[PDB]
């Protein structure tokens, strides 16, 4: 619904440590001690779309990424002021669907940039302030563009897309809907 933005951050930072050989949960606190969002309420599709779009961002900046830690000065919590520099541009110059994946992508990398210097304690801190920045700043904008579901409508996980595309090639049809949108309680 709303705090599901937390997942989108967390799931990515988790994967970020995974490709380094670190654990997110070992250095976490986000959903560790408090429960914000489910394991994939709405996000199951949106985070699935997010990680793909995030990947699209990673490789592109990966050229500079390894060197930039010197520029951001990835250190104690003030690395969020380093990531501030960038999230600052990131918001002013065009907050779109795929644009937001950049925020959670470099944020997930910001995580590892900390773990890099063996400061994996930032890992949970960043994820907190990332999802929060989404909560306060991004979420309104997101809603103006449809929402997280809409993101997967546009740039959703094409792996699952191709997965269902196989049988959809034969056209399954015979699927009617009496349901109207996602209902809440």
């Amino acid at each position: 619904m709303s705090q599901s933005n937390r997942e989108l951050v967390v799931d990515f930072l988790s994967y970020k440590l995974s490709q380094k050989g670190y654990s997110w949960s070992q250095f976490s606190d986000v959903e560790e001690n408090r429960t914000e969002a489910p394991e994939g309420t709405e996000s199951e599709a949106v985070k699935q779309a997010l990680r793909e779009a995030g990947d699209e961002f990673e490789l592109r900046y990966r050229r500079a990424f390894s060197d930039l830690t010197s520029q951001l000065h990835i250190t104690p919590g003030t690395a969020y002021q380093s990531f501030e520099q960038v999230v600052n541009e990131l918001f002013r110059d065009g907050v779109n669907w795929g644009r937001i994946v950049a925020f959670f992508s470099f944020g997930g990398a910001l995580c590892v940039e900390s773990v890099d210097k063996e400061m994996q304690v930032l890992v949970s801190r960043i994820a907190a302030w990332m999802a929060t920045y989404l909560n306060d700043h991004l979420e309104p904008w997101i809603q103006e563009n449809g929402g997280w579901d809409t993101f997967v409508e546009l740039y959703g996980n094409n792996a699952a897309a191709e997965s269902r595309k196989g049988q959809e090639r034969l056209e399954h049809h015979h699927h009617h809907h009496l349901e109207h949108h996602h209902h809440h309680h």
Binding site: R60, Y61, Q71, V86, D93, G98, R99, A102
Partner: peptide, 16 residues
Amino acid sequence: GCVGRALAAFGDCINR
């Protein structure tokens, strides 16, 4: 330097 400018810029490439 960069980063703010760099991700600002490289970020507009999340489509093409």
